[PDB]
Design a binder for these strands. Structure first.
Length: 144
RNA sequence: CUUUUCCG
């Protein structure tokens, strides 16, 4: 019943419901601050799954921006969802712009003293179906 | 693969 799940059903997505639901999550985040909104978490989660089956560039962009604004504040759930999306989604259907984003954020995450991104990227290669990997990122995987 | 079930 929660829009975060209902919008994931076979034919459950409508523009009206999503926008109303997207608005509430954003408003709650603004009101209670970053890392303090239960909905926003739902929206992050809704995003990583939904985009895997229904890629929308503009939606992915908002997803990506909000996740990185959260992570730089210390609340990394949104970024984990983005990484989960990158690994799971690109596995499902490969997109070069998205994969290039994947490599970029994975490097930034590892350079930030983190392992979540690197582990998700490694997992992608393992379950993925000739790609040009970043040489600096290739070195990071070697020590993983 | 940490984040649901009606506070309109």
């Amino acid at each position: 019943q929660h829009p975060s799940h209902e919008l994931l059903k076979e034919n459950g997505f409508t523009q009206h419901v999503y926008h109303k639901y997207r608005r509430r999550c954003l408003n709650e985040r603004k009101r209670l601050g970053i890392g303090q909104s239960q909905e926003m978490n739902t929206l992050f989660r809704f995003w990583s799954f939904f985009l895997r089956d229904h890629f929308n560039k503009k939606m992915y962009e908002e997803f990506k921006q909000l996740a990185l604004e959260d992570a730089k504040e210390g609340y990394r759930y949104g970024l984990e969802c983005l990484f989960r999306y990158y690994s799971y989604g690109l596995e499902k259907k490969f997109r070069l712009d998205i994969f290039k984003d994947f490599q970029e954020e994975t490097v930034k995450d590892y350079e930030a003293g983190q392992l979540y991104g690197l582990e998700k990227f490694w997992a992608f290669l393992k379950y993925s179906k000739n790609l040009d990997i970043d040489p600096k990122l290739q070195e990071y995987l070697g020590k993983f």
